[PDB]
Design a protein around this motif. Structure first.
Motif, short mmCIF file in Angstrom:
data_model
loop_
_atom_site.label_atom_id
_atom_site.label_comp_id
_atom_site.label_asym_id
_atom_site.label_seq_id
_atom_site.Cartn_x
_atom_site.Cartn_y
_atom_site.Cartn_z
N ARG A 165 -2.39 12.58 10.09
CA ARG A 165 -2.88 11.30 10.73
C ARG A 165 -2.38 11.23 8.45
O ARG A 165 -2.62 9.86 8.25
N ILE A 166 -3.50 11.87 7.75
CA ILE A 166 -3.81 11.49 6.13
C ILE A 166 -2.80 10.92 5.74
O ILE A 166 -2.34 10.12 4.89
N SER A 167 -1.60 12.35 6.46
CA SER A 167 -0.54 12.70 5.39
C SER A 167 0.24 11.12 6.20
O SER A 167 1.30 10.71 5.55
N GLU A 168 0.41 10.90 7.65
CA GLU A 168 0.92 9.03 7.76
C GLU A 168 0.73 8.01 6.78
O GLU A 168 1.75 7.34 6.61
N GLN A 169 -0.88 8.15 6.63
CA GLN A 169 -1.02 7.11 6.25
C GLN A 169 -0.42 6.70 4.63
O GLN A 169 -0.53 6.30 4.30
N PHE A 170 -0.35 8.21 4.34
CA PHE A 170 -0.78 7.68 2.72
C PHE A 170 1.30 8.55 2.58
O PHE A 170 1.86 6.89 1.51
N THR A 171 2.17 8.78 3.42
CA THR A 171 3.87 7.63 3.29
C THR A 171 3.96 6.53 3.98
O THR A 171 4.94 6.45 2.88
N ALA A 172 3.31 6.16 4.33
CA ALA A 172 3.45 4.90 4.65
C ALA A 172 3.49 3.96 3.33
O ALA A 172 4.25 3.00 3.40
N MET A 173 2.24 4.23 2.67
CA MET A 173 1.95 3.93 1.33
C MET A 173 2.93 3.98 0.58
O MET A 173 3.27 2.84 -0.53
N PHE A 174 3.33 5.18 0.03
CA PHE A 174 3.62 5.81 -0.86
C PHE A 174 5.02 5.36 -0.83
O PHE A 174 6.19 5.08 -1.85
N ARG A 175 5.97 5.22 0.15
CA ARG A 175 6.70 4.97 0.33
C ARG A 175 6.98 4.00 -0.53
O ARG A 175 9.02 3.20 -0.89
N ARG A 176 6.72 2.20 0.00
CA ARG A 176 6.01 1.47 -0.91
C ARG A 176 6.25 1.65 -2.66
O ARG A 176 5.75 0.17 -2.80
N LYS A 177 5.18 2.58 -2.56
CA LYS A 177 4.63 3.13 -4.16
C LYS A 177 3.72 1.84 -3.92
O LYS A 177 2.82 2.13 -5.37
N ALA A 178 2.61 1.39 -3.12
CA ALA A 178 1.79 0.18 -2.72
C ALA A 178 0.95 0.68 -3.69
O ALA A 178 0.42 2.44 -3.99
N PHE A 179 0.12 0.21 -4.51
CA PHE A 179 -1.43 0.64 -4.95
C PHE A 179 -1.40 2.20 -6.11
O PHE A 179 -2.22 2.31 -6.82
N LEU A 180 0.03 2.02 -6.21
CA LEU A 180 0.42 3.39 -7.09
C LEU A 180 -0.35 2.91 -8.79
O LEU A 180 -0.91 4.38 -9.36
N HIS A 181 -0.28 2.02 -8.86
CA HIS A 181 -0.60 1.20 -10.42
C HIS A 181 -2.15 1.77 -10.88
O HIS A 181 -1.82 1.77 -12.05
N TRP A 182 -3.45 1.81 -10.17
CA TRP A 182 -4.33 2.09 -10.05
C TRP A 182 -4.46 3.44 -11.17
O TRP A 182 -5.37 3.54 -11.14
N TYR A 183 -3.99 4.34 -10.06
CA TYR A 183 -3.09 5.98 -10.70
C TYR A 183 -2.43 6.24 -11.73
O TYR A 183 -2.37 6.54 -12.70
N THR A 184 -1.15 5.32 -11.66
CA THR A 184 -0.46 5.43 -13.16
C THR A 184 -1.06 5.27 -14.49
O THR A 184 -0.92 5.34 -15.83
N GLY A 185 -2.24 4.12 -14.30
CA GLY A 185 -2.25 3.38 -15.15
C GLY A 185 -3.50 4.34 -15.90
O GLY A 185 -4.68 4.10 -17.08
N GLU A 186 -4.27 5.29 -15.32
CA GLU A 186 -5.08 6.24 -15.44
C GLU A 186 -4.45 7.93 -16.15
O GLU A 186 -5.04 8.79 -16.33
N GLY A 187 -3.08 7.38 -16.51
CA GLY A 187 -1.87 8.43 -17.05
C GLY A 187 -1.65 9.91 -15.72
O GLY A 187 -0.77 10.61 -16.41
N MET A 188 -1.86 9.35 -15.05
CA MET A 188 -0.37 9.87 -13.90
C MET A 188 0.33 9.86 -13.57
O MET A 188 0.70 9.04 -13.29
N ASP A 189 1.61 10.50 -13.20
CA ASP A 189 2.51 10.34 -12.59
C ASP A 189 3.23 10.35 -11.26
O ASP A 189 2.27 10.81 -10.25
N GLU A 190 4.32 9.56 -10.73
CA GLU A 190 4.21 9.63 -9.34
C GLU A 190 4.93 10.50 -8.11
O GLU A 190 4.36 11.71 -7.07
N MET A 191 5.29 12.38 -9.94
CA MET A 191 5.31 13.45 -9.51
C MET A 191 4.14 14.33 -9.19
O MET A 191 4.08 15.41 -7.88
#
Ligand SMILES: Nc1nc2c(ncn2[C@@H]2O[C@H](COP(=O)(O)OP(=O)(O)OP(=O)(O)O)[C@@H](O)[C@H]2O)c(=O)[nH]1
Ligand SMILES: Nc1ncnc2c1ncn2[C@@H]1O[C@H](COP(=O)(O)OP(=O)(O)CP(=O)(O)O)[C@@H](O)[C@H]1O
Ligand SMILES: Nc1nc2c(ncn2[C@@H]2O[C@H](COP(=O)(O)OP(=O)(O)O)[C@@H](O)[C@H]2O)c(=O)[nH]1
Ligand SMILES: CC(C)C(=O)N1CCN(C(C)C)CC1
Ligand SMILES: [Ca+2]
Ligand SMILES: [Ca+2]
Ligand SMILES: [Ca+2]
Ligand SMILES: [Mg+2]
Ligand SMILES: [Mg+2]
Ligand SMILES: [Mg+2]
Lengths: 438, 425, 54, 349
Positions: free
Chosen positions: B378-404
């Motif tokens: 369940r968590i994996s499906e919800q994760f991928t649904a957003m991650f495939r579009r990189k949705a909401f990632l800026h909250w995390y990349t703004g703290e120095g994280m990379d998509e990798m």
């Protein structure tokens, strides 16, 4: 007179040892404070009971025993229990955290840090013996300490006491009173490294003790106290010859001579009768023939198996109570004409019989009833290999998936020791089949 | 003297941790001021496992309260048993974590972690023989999830041979605060797979469904959910807090429950769960039937969809221990297809004479079932649904994280699922 | 059915009945095992600390 | 809901028992390696008896008696009969047999030759048969011993019933197969239905080379006999027809002339080994179906040929017998939520 030193390792060994020495004191008339009014030689003496008890100038009779556990909660019971006065602190050794049902943790990790201390304490007892016979080692198969630390201790004992005999009283794992899933692993790991160091081992299957308590004592859900008081009766029967005047099994060496013609096959089956409930209205006392015939009933064996389909290599009948040799032979004759008793061709078809007139002692308020006579039969049957087969099977089921193996490797053990130990048990099972089957 | 150090982090972690100490403090006869007023010595037998003993016979929990905002821990301090906690054990910041794993793990959390470890060290230095640690936290937020797993990683570094245990609340869309909860949970599971020996998976959807369907609470609140977690935490730790032989040690419990190091995520269960017909006596057969019913489990994973690797069952109260063994043997023998056959006797039962407050008897269920994979799916499906579009990632990349870093956590969690599936066959 | 070696004393007696005739590691090596396992544990912990430092 | 496992996929019998068990809706079958079972339909060879009866809470039952091989092995049966006082060497219903080991391996060679020479001297019929668990019929001792040396397994040489009872018309040999079920309480139940496996070739005492009229095995008759199925379907005559024949031809009944002796033999064999194989006080329970094979001579005397430990059943009798196995052997221990088809051979335990 030659001394025997008892060593109790792990929870099972300690608690069983507690029930044995309690029984020994009642048998030899020793009080919890260590005093013994019947001992007219104060401060010493070389009587038969002196093989298990030393004496101080103050007349205290001190067991020749060492208690060892990697965790203190069980041995703390001894330090404050009824017989707290029997042992001095040097004899009670405890660590701070146990082996967590992990053979490798008890053998390698924690054993390495406490082994030299234990030997130092054992050396102290040996120094008091003018002619030490050897050791009796009580432990479980399934516990991390009973399995892992005992095998290490046995190795060092062979180094520090090469000419000394070593007998074992081992608790075979039973799921009805066990909460550890990896006990098959531990049982087989400890039997592999101990096998060459034990001259004669008496396996007690908790499953058997459990059902005897439910069937004969009417205990719906037996406790460790119920199991241990019954185990100590059997242990008393086996060690009585060392503690009382007699001519059979008078020293540890005689156990190997009378029960083990082949060294690896050193696991005699124990059978005991009668076990009567103290809550009974009142029991009809069993005769020499009835209690003897019971020694060939699986329901009374310490390990459930079928001797009818194995072969005997030796057989000792240890009687306590009102028994004369005449009634013994008459019962044996009747049993030969009705039972399936097949000996190996390279062994005589006979029975060594010991009779001790003093009937079995019972712990006041305990579960067992006072009986006028009882017997414990020690027979070396190939049928006890059934227990190895059961154990090896459970080992194979888990090891095929490597289940739980990471816990042992994480303690510094190599995975290869698993199959090394398993291959040794496969050889042990083959030896039994060569000796028993045609 | 086998001490356990308790840590609760973030909003969810502290509110549940609070109720936990409230529940067990009652069982051990400790009042809100740390004074003992029980009537049984069984209460104090193993009291030092979770409590320190101060002057005047006072009992102070061995708990460390951590947060990046003051709010929740102010409530605890102003709460019922707030006075019972060591005042110095409140370690908190002011910035908050914005439900952002990166803030709790890398930026905001990294600024506060050293001072938390100073309190952890001080508590350990007093332990005669420290068993290990237990952390209560959620995976869907920022502090409990991000900083929680940061604290675990740093505790492993300073105490590499001590047991690390957690109660982890898994997010659910049905009981969600923000859309980024799957991101935070997948990042935490990545940490947990490697750095804990035992993790009790508590799914807020199961707790919700239980409050609505079984307890008949029209509108469940977080407080209602937390009551269930309190009762579950008290149950699964009974083996540790009272005299017993089953799983009296954290390391012994792990040896009997964890056949493979990565598969240490348990489904907890509790019985009874009665709605207000609440005074009726519950029989041992009923206790057992319910304790094994999916509706009584809190991971929201139907056990009939997988197989049990191991099972730990604790029965509390005065009852027929003979009848307990029978009923347990009845469940296994009547459904042995759901128990792997390559781990003999993988169901262990423990009994405790002291029941929980207001119950003649109860049973707590601890399962290591391959069905837990459905939770990570369940968590994996919800994760991928957003991650495939990189949705909401800026909250995390703004703290120095990379998509990798997201890709690696996802890949590790999917690997975890595949491992549950291979042992299920 | 013959009885042999009958011994009698005040506290009991023993005898034998025949129904039918017939037809280690040194101290050093132990220390090595222990120290070898301890070394394997040390290597595993150093790998953990190396991983954590990264 | 009871549980059971199947470990002999080749058993036509228990395959039907397993089928009936599932048809009751109260039995569940588990994988063959699952230990949590009530009932084991075990394998023939090396059945792991030592792992039975150690499952807390499960009353376990198996369909084989440990030690019954003593009765169902050619060499063992001979040794059991000569050594057991209950059967004695003077046992009248078992042919004079000897255990002979090939010279490439105690052995009863000299003892056999002594009795052989005695017969050859007294003009008596001296025709013997050699077999093992590959058969040879000969009147010369030199041929019987040489044939065994060419092999490498234990063999048995017993007297060949030169005067068998021949059915008419046809002048043909036969043997009787009795199915016997012993349950966990060691009650001996004789299935009311037997089968005569008849030879469709006329008996010829002057030519033991053609073994088609001498061996009444169902396989040999259906392969090397040219009159198969002529007189009775599948060379199988059942008690109803056989009894009517005994009345029309010999003016006697199957019960008086043959069945009494059969029941006596079954009892004597099973009661003899009861102390050795009984599971009365054991941690598990055993039952087992046995196939007794008898011979009948022209004096209506009944001889025991062998005892099969894993017998098969006649196609027409599978239903009744298998159902009977469930009633008295399995449901007697695991009850479910007549006019018995068996005959209880009462005996002293
Ligand atoms: N008969 C009997 N068996 C016991 C007793 N105590 C424990 N056992 C058995 O021993 C096994 C567990 O091993 P323990 O002796 O308790 O463990 P240990 O030797 O103390 O080793 P650790 O893992 O360090 O605790 C189980 O199979 C128990 O059933 C006892 O007092 N009597
Ligand atoms: N002593 C004897 N006298 C006469 N015939 C004999 C005999 N021994 C065996 N037979 C014949 O051999 C046949 C059975 O052989 P046997 O039973 O020993 O081999 P087998 O066990 O492989 C077949 P089955 O197990 O089905 O009975 C019978 O039909 C019988 O006619
Ligand atoms: N069961 C329970 N879950 C909670 C509670 N508070 C928050 N949650 C859940 O935890 C997640 C939010 O994390 P939170 O703890 O508030 O963030 P944090 O303060 O940064 O650690 C969401 O999935 C919520 O559903 C609570 O009191 N009880
Ligand atoms: C013996 C071994 C190193 C040990 O102590 N463990 C395994 C690892 N685990 C952590 C993952 C929390 C801690 C406990
Ligand atoms: Ca003296
Ligand atoms: Ca030696
Ligand atoms: Ca800042
Ligand atoms: Mg212990
Ligand atoms: Mg929040
Ligand atoms: Mg045959």
């Amino acid at each position: 007179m030659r001394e025997c030193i008892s060593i109790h390792v792990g929870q099972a060994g300690v608690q069983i040892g507690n029930a044995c020495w309690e029984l020994y004191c009642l048998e030899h008339g020793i009080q919890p404070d260590g005093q013994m009014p019947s001992d007219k030689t104060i401060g010493g003496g070389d009587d038969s009971f002196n093989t298990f008890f030393s004496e101080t100038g103050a007349g205290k009779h001190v067991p020749r025993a060492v208690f060892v556990d990697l965790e203190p909660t069980v041995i703390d019971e001894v330090r404050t229990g009824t017989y707290r006065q029997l042992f001095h602190p040097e004899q009670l050794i405890t660590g701070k955290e146990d082996a967590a049902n992990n053979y490798a943790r008890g053998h390698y990790t924690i054993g390495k840090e406490i082994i030299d201390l234990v030997l130092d304490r054992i050396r102290k007892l040996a120094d008091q013996c003018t002619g030490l016979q050897g050791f009796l080692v009580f432990h479980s198969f399934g516990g991390g300490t009973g399995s892992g630390f005992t095998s290490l201790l046995m190795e060092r004992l062979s180094v520090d006491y090469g000419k000394k005999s070593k007998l074992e009283f081992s608790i075979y794992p039973a799921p009805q009173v066990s909460t550890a899933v990896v006990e098959p692993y531990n049982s087989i790991l400890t039997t592999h490294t101990t096998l060459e160091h034990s001259d004669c081992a008496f396996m007690v299957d908790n499953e058997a003790i459990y059902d005897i308590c439910r069937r004969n004592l009417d205990i719906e859900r037996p406790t460790y106290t119920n199991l241990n008081r019954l185990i100590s009766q059997i242990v008393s029967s086996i060690t009585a010859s060392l503690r009382f005047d007699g001519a059979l099994n008078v020293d540890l060496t005689e156990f190997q001579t009378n029960l083990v013609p082949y060294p690896r096959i050193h696991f005699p089956l124990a059978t005991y009768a009668p076990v009567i409930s103290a809550e009974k209205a009142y029991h009809e006392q069993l005769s020499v023939a009835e209690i003897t015939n019971a020694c060939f009933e699986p329901a009374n064996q310490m390990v459930k198996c079928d001797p009818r389909h194995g072969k005997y290599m030796a057989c000792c009948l240890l009687y306590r109570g009102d028994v004369v040799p005449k009634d013994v032979n008459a019962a044996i004759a009747t049993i030969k004409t009705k039972r399936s008793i097949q000996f190996v061709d390279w062994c005589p078809t006979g029975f060594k019989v010991g009779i001790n007139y003093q009937p079995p002692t019972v712990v006041p308020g305990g579960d067992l009833a006072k009986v006028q006579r009882a017997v414990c039969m020690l027979s070396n049957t190939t049928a006890i290999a059934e227990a190895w087969a059961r154990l090896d099977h459970k080992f194979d089921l888990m090891y095929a998936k490597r289940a739980f193996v990471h816990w042992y490797v994480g303690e510094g053990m190599e995975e290869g020791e698993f199959s090394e130990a398993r291959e040794d048990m496969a050889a042990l099972e083959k030896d039994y089949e060569e000796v028993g089957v045609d | 003297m086998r001490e356990i150090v308790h840590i609760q982090a973030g909003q969810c972690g502290n509110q549940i941790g609070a109720k936990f100490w409230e529940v067990i403090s009652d069982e051990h006869g400790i009042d809100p001021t740390g004074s003992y007023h029980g009537d049984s010595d069984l209460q104090l037998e193993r009291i030092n496992v979770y409590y320190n003993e101060a002057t005047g016979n006072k009992y102070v929990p061995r708990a460390i309260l951590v947060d990046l905002e003051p709010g929740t821990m102010d409530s605890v301090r102003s709460g019922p048993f707030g006075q019972i906690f060591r005042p110095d054990n409140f370690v908190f910041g002011q910035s908050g974590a914005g439900n952002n794993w990166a803030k709790g793990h890398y930026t905001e959390g990294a600024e506060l972690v050293d001072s938390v470890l100073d309190v952890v060290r001080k508590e350990s230095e007093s332990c005669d023989c420290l068993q290990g640690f237990q952390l209560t936290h959620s995976l869907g937020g920022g502090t409990g999830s991000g900083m929680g797993t940061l604290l675990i990683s740093k505790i492993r570094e300073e105490y590499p041979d001590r047991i690390m245990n957690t109660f982890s609340v898994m997010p659910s869309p049905k009981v969600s605060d923000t859309v980024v909860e799957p991101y935070n949970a997948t990042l935490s599971v990545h940490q947990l797979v490697e750095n804990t020996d035992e993790t009790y998976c508590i799914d807020n959807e199961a707790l919700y469904d239980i409050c609505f369907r079984t307890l008949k609470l029209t509108t469940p609140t977080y407080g209602d959910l937390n009551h269930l977690v309190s009762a579950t935490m008290s149950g699964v730790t009974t083996c540790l807090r009272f005299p017993g032989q089953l799983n009296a040690d954290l390391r012994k419990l792990a040896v009997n429950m964890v056949p493979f190091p990565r598969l240490h995520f348990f489904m907890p269960g509790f019985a009874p769960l009665t709605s207000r017909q609440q005074y009726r006596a519950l029989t041992v057969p009923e206790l057992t039937q319910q304790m094994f019913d999916s509706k009584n489990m809190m991971a929201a994973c139907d056990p009939r969809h997988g197989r049990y690797l191991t099972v730990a069952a604790i029965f509390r109260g005065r009852m027929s221990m003979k009848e307990v063994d029978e009923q347990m043997l009845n469940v296994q023998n009547k459904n042995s297809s759901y128990f792997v056959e390559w781990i003999p006797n993988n169901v262990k039962t423990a009994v405790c004479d002291i029941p929980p407050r207001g119950l003649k008897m109860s049973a707590t269920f601890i399962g290591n079932s391959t069905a837990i994979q459905e939770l990570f799916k369940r968590i994996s499906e919800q994760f991928t649904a957003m991650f495939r579009r990189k949705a909401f990632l800026h909250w995390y990349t703004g703290e120095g994280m990379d998509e990798m870093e997201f890709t690696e956590a996802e890949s590790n969690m999917n690997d975890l699922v595949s491992e549950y599936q291979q042992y299920q066959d | 059915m013959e009885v042999i070696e009958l011994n009698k004393c005040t506290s009991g007696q023993s005898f034998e009945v025949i129904l039918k005739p017939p037809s280690d590691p040194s101290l050093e090596e132990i220390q090595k095992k222990l120290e070898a396992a301890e070394e394997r544990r040390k290597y595993q912990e150093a790998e953990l600390l190396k991983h954590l430092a990264e | 809901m009871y549980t059971f496992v199947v470990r002999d996929e080749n058993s036509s019998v228990y395959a039907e028992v397993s089928r009936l068990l599932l048809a009751t809706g109260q039995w569940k079958r588990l994988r063959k390696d699952n230990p949590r079972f009530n009932l084991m339909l075990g394998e023939r060879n090396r059945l792991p008896f030592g792992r039975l009866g150690h499952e807390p809470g499960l009353v376990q039952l198996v369909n084989y008696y440990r030690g019954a091989d003593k009765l169902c092995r050619k060499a063992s049966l001979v040794k059991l009969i000569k050594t057991s006082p209950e059967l004695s060497e003077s046992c009248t219903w078992f042919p004079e047999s000897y255990v002979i080991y090939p010279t490439n391996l105690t052995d009863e060679r000299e003892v056999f030759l002594a009795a052989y020479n005695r017969r050859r001297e007294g003009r008596e019929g001296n025709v013997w048969i050699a077999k093992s668990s590959g058969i040879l019929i000969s009147s010369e001792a030199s041929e019987l011993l040489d044939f065994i040396d060419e092999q490498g397994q234990v063999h048995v040489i017993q007297k060949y019933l030169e005067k068998p009872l021949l059915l008419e018309p046809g002048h043909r040999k036969f043997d009787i197969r009795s199915w016997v079920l012993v349950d966990h309480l060691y009650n001996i139940y004789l299935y009311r239905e037997g089968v005569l496996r008849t030879s469709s070739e006329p008996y010829n005492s002057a030519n033991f080379q053609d073994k088609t009229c001498h061996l009444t095995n169902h396989c040999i008759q259906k392969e090397y006999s040219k009159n198969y199925g002529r007189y009775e379907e599948g060379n199988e005559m059942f008690f109803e027809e056989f009894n009517q024949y005994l009345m029309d031809a010999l003016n006697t009944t199957l019960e008086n002339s043959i069945l009494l002796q059969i029941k006596h033999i079954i009892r004597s064999c099973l009661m003899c080994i009861e102390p050795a194989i009984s599971t009365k006080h054991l941690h598990y329970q055993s039952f087992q179906l046995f196939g007794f094979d008898f011979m009948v001579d022209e004096e209506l005397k009944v001889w025991l040929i062998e005892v099969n430990g894993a017998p098969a059943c006649a196609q027409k009798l599978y239903a009744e017998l298998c159902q009977g196995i469930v009633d008295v052997a399995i449901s007697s221990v695991f009850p479910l939520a007549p006019t018995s088809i068996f005959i209880k051979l009462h005996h002293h335990h």
